[PDB]
Structures are given as C-alpha cells and as structure tokens.
Structure 1
Amino acid sequence: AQNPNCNIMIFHPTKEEFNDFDKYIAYMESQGAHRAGLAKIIPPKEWKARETYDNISEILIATPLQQVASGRAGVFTQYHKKKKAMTVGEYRHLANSKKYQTPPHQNFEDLERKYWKNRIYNSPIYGADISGSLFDENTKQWNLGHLGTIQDLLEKECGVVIEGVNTPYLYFGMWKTTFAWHTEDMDLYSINYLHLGEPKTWYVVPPEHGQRLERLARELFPGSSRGCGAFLRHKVALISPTVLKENGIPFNRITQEAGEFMVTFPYGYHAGFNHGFNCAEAINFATPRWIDYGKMASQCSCGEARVTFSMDAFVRILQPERYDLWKRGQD
C-alpha cells in the first residue's frame, strides 16, 4: 500500500504531465496521495494562471463575512456576520490596516502559534464563496474554470443525465480568516489555487480516520451534536492541533504559498487559516473513485447547512433513501 502513514505529498509535474488533469490526479492516487486527504501540486515553471493581478481591484465582494468566535482558544465555533459590500481594493486596504494586518513574526511556525493563541480575540473579515474565476481563458492547463463537470462525471460513470452546473469560487482572505473543519459537499474532491498574496495553512485528517475526528467533535461540541447528526456540514467548528494531539487524532499540516495548488480528497476533513491578504480560487470535482464516497456521504437535514442547487441531483441519484428528509432540510 502506497503512503501508509498518510503523509501529505508534494508533486512537481512537468509541463507535459500538466496537460491531462484527470490522468495526473489518477497518478497522484497511484502513489498514495489520497491517503493523506490533501496534496500539494507545484505547477511547472513555464505555467501561469494569468499575466498579472494588477487589474482585480474592482471585483465586488457583495457580502463580506466577519468571523466572530466563541469558545476557548483551541476549541471554538465561528459565526459569520454579514457586512456591507466592498470592492477587492477596499478589502485589501482593510486587510492591511493596523486593526487587521498580520503581526510581526519569525517564520510560519511562529505565526501558527500566534494564530492559535489569539484567533478568538479578533473577528477578521473574509470574502468567501464569490462565484467567478481569475484564470485567463487562454490558460489551458489546470484552469479551474475549464474542468470536466461533476454532472458529466456522474453521467459517464453511472449513465444518468442530471441537471446542475459546477463553477469556481473566489476567496479573498486576511490574517486570521478561518476555514472550519469540514469535508466537501457530498464528500467531493476540491482543488484550490492560491492566486496571490500571503500563505494559507492547512490541517487535514486522513480519510480513513475521519470518523475519529467526528467522534471528537461530538464530544467537544455536545449541543451541536444533539442538534444535528452531521453538524460539521455547518462549517463552523474549529479544533486546534494541540487539542487534536491531546486526543490522539491523526492529522497533518502544510502551508500553501501563492502559485501553488492544493487538492483535497473525498472525505478528507480539512481546516485552516490565512496569513494575510490573499486570493484563492477553488472548485469541487469528481473522479470515478469518488462515486462510492458520494453514496456514503453524511448529510445535514437540520436546515443549517443549506447548499447549492446542484447538490439536489447528487442526493437524489446517489442517496435516494435520504432524499426526502434531506430536501425537507433544504426547504
């Protein structure tokens, strides 16, 4: 078995290997990358996502989210308070302001220490989940707006034609902006490209050990657990590396820098934080190996998780028994 310790692997494809996206994902899995839940892909040196980032300031963040924390430094939840619209140029200035800017630090480990010590005492503002793309249309390799769609994969694998679309989303982050512990909708893959700015630190639990994280989470968030049998679908709970180590949960960590891709694998729980002003782009995708994970994915039916139009069909076809209850949650 490849990668039996489930370490995060880092890949350096050549320009020739960067042509065929599906093939390269399948290569990475042949080397055991999926066992970690997360992989890093450094593009060939010849590749670029677009020519420059000099003209992005007029993108609108229609609903910036202030991420307010409750709990203790290592075990907290966050809720998202909606703020007034602002442009990317306005947001970048805000991120760089004395109130929100990254503090002085020695290296990534020192910054990680400072994040875990102090996150809860601040409420950073995140521009998340903004439909759109920063890939140039002429970028033919690993262009996250040109991937094969999950609806087309389900159709290719299973023969059933379904409605729905699959488009990318932009994330504009600042120091301390936080992504809570989660897997993807329907335990899909995700791919994330850090277009610009400061790094993003990731934490990930190997898919084979995801239920260990879920059991810890039910212990640490006991009212949430009673409210919903899949409350991590709410994407609000944080658990620090120190707490994970205290409770014996297997995980790994890695920092993504500008110009790098990360891939999350089906049922790989992940969480993380931004180091400073940045912009990422991410999309879900599927492969043939995902289908079995989609069929088994947990679902939130309490009403909190509220998701895209396109998840309907996935539940309806892969999880017909759950469909009725899940749809009641959505309506």
Structure 2
Amino acid sequence: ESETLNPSARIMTFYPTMEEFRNFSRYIAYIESQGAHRAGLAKVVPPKEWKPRASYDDIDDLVIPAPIQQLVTGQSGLFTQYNIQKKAMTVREFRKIANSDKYCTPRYSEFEELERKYWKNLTFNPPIYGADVNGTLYEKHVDEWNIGRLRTILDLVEKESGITIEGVNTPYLYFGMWKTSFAWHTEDMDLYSINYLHFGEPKSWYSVPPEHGKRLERLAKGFFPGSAQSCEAFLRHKMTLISPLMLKKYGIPFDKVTQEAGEFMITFPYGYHAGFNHGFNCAESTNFATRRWIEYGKQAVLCSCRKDMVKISMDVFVRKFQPERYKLWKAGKDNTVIDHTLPTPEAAEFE
C-alpha cells in the first residue's frame, strides 16, 4: 500500500480547503496517507482566506538579541559554515543592512540563475542571519496551524516534565537576508518541523528522502573524516553545506522547492534538508510529533561531543504509546526496524 504512494519520493504540494485546514494533526496524517513524508519535505499552501496576522508594519522595534554572521569556507560544492555572533539589533536595523547595496539580492531571470549565484558566492561577503529569535507573530486568536500551540503529542514533554526547549516545543523567528543559509540537517531527536514564511523574499529548500538519508550521511562522513571521528552525528552541528551538483555527482537522490511568503513547509522525521534565503524575509518555526515519530525518537543518533545538545527522554512516550514494548526497550532488546514509507497510524482514517 505505502510502497506505491509517492514512489518517486518527490516533494508534494497541498492546497487544503479551510475545512481541511482547521485540524492540524489530521491534515498531517492526511498528507502522509498521500505519501508526502517520503520526500522528507512537503509544501502546504493555506486557503487565500487565511492569515495569521493582519499587519506586520508594527515589528520594526522587535529585538534580534543574537544576530549571526555566517562565514562560509570551502570549495567544489562542499563547505563548512562558521557562526560569528554579533551584537543585538532591531528588525529595522536588520532590514536596513539586508536591503543595502552590499547585502541585497542580485538581479536575475529564472530561479536557476539565483541558485547558481548562491553556490558561486556563498563564501564571499558574509551575511547576517537573525536566527533563533524567541517569539511568535501569530495573533492570539488564530486557532489554525498556530506554531505557538499545535497540540501534538510533543506536548507530552512539557506536560510530564515542565521542560521547555526553545525552538523545539516553543516557536522561533528567523529574519533572513540574501545568501543566509541553513546547513544540511534533520531536526533534534529526528522530529517533524513546521516552517511558515510570514513575509518577504523566498526561501529555497533542498531535501533528501528519509529512505536515502543514510547515503547522505555516508557521503558526509567520507568528505569530513575528522568530524566523523570526533562526533557520532556531526551533521547535527548544522555547519555543513553541500551543493546539489555534489549530491548529483554521488548519486544521492534529492529534490528542490522554493517557499514563498504565506506558505508552510513541513519536514518529516529523518528528512535531511538545507537551503538559503533569497533576500529579506521572516520565518517562524517549531518542532512537532506524531505517533510515528516515537520510533525515530528512540533510534535518533545524537551529537556526542557537546553537552549543549537537545535530548528528549523517550521513556514517557514508550510507556504511553508502546507499553507492550517498554520492558524490551528498556532491556535494550527492541530491534524494531523503521519503514520510512509507512504513514503515521493516525492516517488510518484516510487509509
């Protein structure tokens, strides 16, 4: 059944009606019944009727406490990105820098032109990414796809333990400018993520199907043996950029998609993604889960070289949703193998 859904594992795009759109978990379950998860990435375009905020003309005073200057080093489609923390600044200050002649978007015809220019000039004139800003731009009453309160089973973390993990069970805002990037990664604990582009120039994405994720890891370990020996999951450092031409060259399947203002991106468990911003923009994002994620969570290989890293206790999820397996899991004998093609069980509604 599942094997025959989206057998190309291409990035799918969905256009829900407002009735479909009102229930978040249900629609995620729906797109999985359509095999969307196999791509590792899906676009969801909300009804034109819908808006999370009436106006963004009131945010110029919003502070970006830790802007990041992105210094990229490398050649031949392989790069390492170093973060240089800069002093706090306001959205208006950032926009000014972003739109200045030094940092603004280059002129171009088709997207393929801008893409070529990104991968040619990535290491020159390091931009500033106003990333990881704690907050939401959703109005308090918006009940559909509210990144602040999505109500998935990831809520069980805070519920059981009181722990908040910034950007994971709370929202992050990202203010981008041209040539700012996010390196190849999956989410913390191999969770889902949701990304909403509030406004501005587009954000382009690359994705590797979860069922081919290990091949990407193998390639990465080969190009960075030093990093691979120092850490069991060095891609979680989110410093590694790899061009689509390199991926092609080594037979890693991947897809590309460009996200525009007003559009959602969903990433799926163990879906590697990377990309860049076209120009000044603003994205909001957080992580979430489904019953399917639990096994990914149990098997996630985490960064072994930093103490700062995100780790969620799987115990409560296994007790509540896999009680028959808890003793086996705790005794280290749970050898369940993940089928990346299966949809989450909540999808059984749509079969």
The normalised TM-score by structure 1 is 0.91
| Aligned residue type for 2:313 | A
1:200 equivalent to 2:203? Answer yes
Choose 183-192 or 222-231, whichever is displaced more.
222-231
Does structure 1 retain, via aligned residues, the 8 Å contact 2:189–2:312?
A: no
Aligned to 1:313: 313
Residues 186, 315 of structure 1: CA spacing in aligned structure 2 closer, same or farther, 3 A cutoff?
A: farther
* Distance change >3 Å, CA 317–CA 142, structure 1 → 2: closer
Give the one of 227, 247, 260 matched to 2:263. Answer: 260
The partner residue of 2:301 within 298, 301, 308 is: 298
Question: Following the alignment from structure 2 to structure 1, what is the Cα–Cα distance between the partners of residues 185 and 315?
Answer: 18
1:18 paired with 2:17, answer no
1:57 correspondence with 2:60 = yes
The code of the aligned residue for 1:189 comes to Y
1:9 maps to amino acid: M
Mapped to 2, the partners of 1:316 and 1:202 lie a distance apart of 33
Counterpart position of 1:164: 163
Name 1:9's counterpart in structure 2: 12
Structure-1 residue corresponding to 2:220 = 217
1: CA distance, partners of 2:30 / 2:312: 31
Given the alignment, which residue of 188, 209, 227 partners 1:185?
188
Q: Secondary structure at the match of 2:28?
A: helix
After superposition, the CA RMSD in angstroms is: 1.9
- Number of residue pairs matched? 315
1:159-184 Cα shifts (integer Å, max 9, x gaps): x9333231100000000000000000
Letter in structure 2 aligned against 1:307 = M
Instruction: State the distance in 2 between where 1:259 and 1:137 align.
Output: 18
Q: Is the 8 A contact 2:207 2:274 kept in 1?
A: yes
Q: Which residue of 2 aligns with 1:118?
A: 121
User: What is the one-letter code of the residue matched to 1:162?
Assistant: S
In structure 1, the residue corresponding to 2:71 is in which secondary structure? Answer: strand
Aligned residue identity for 2:198: H
Q: Distance in 1 between matches of 2:154 and 2:255?
A: 31
Q: Which segments of 5 or more consecutive residues in structure 1 lack a partner in the other structure?
A: 323-331
Partner AA of 1:313 in structure 2:
S
Contact residue 198 and residue 282 of structure 2 kept, 8 A: yes
Q: 2:151 aligns with which of 148, 151, 154?
A: 148
Say whether residues 1:245 and 2:248 are aligned partners: yes
Of 185-194 and 225-234, the range deviating more from structure 2: 225-234
Structure 2 residue runs of 5 or longer lacking an equivalent are 319-328, 333-351
Give the drift of 1:312.
Answer: 4.1
Offset at residue 119 of structure 1 (A): 0.7
Tell me the SS of whatever aligns to 1:100.
coil
Per the TM alignment, residue 315 of structure 1 is displaced from its structure 2 partner at its CA by 7.9
Counterpart secondary structure, 2:205: strand
Specify whether residues 120 and 150 from structure 1 end up closer, same or farther in structure 2 by C-alpha distance, changes over 3 A only: farther
Shift of 1:316: 8.8
Q: Is the 8 A contact 2:154 2:288 kept in 1?
A: no
What's the secondary structure of 1:161's corresponding residue? helix
Q: What is the aligned-residue identity percentage?
A: 63
Matched, 1:67 2:78: no
Between the aligned partners of 2:295 and 2:154, the Cα distance in structure 1 is 15
- Where 1:121 maps in the other structure, the secondary structure is coil
TM-score (norm 2): 0.86
- SS across alignment from 1:105: coil
Query: 1:79-158 counterparts in 2 under 5 A?
Result: 79-153=82-156
- Pick one of 77, 80, 85 that aligns with 1:77: 80
- The answer to whether the 8 Å contact 2:303/2:309 transfers is no
Indicate conservation of the 8 Å contact 1:206/1:269, yes or no: yes
1:71–1:238 distance in 2 versus 1, CA, 3 Å? same
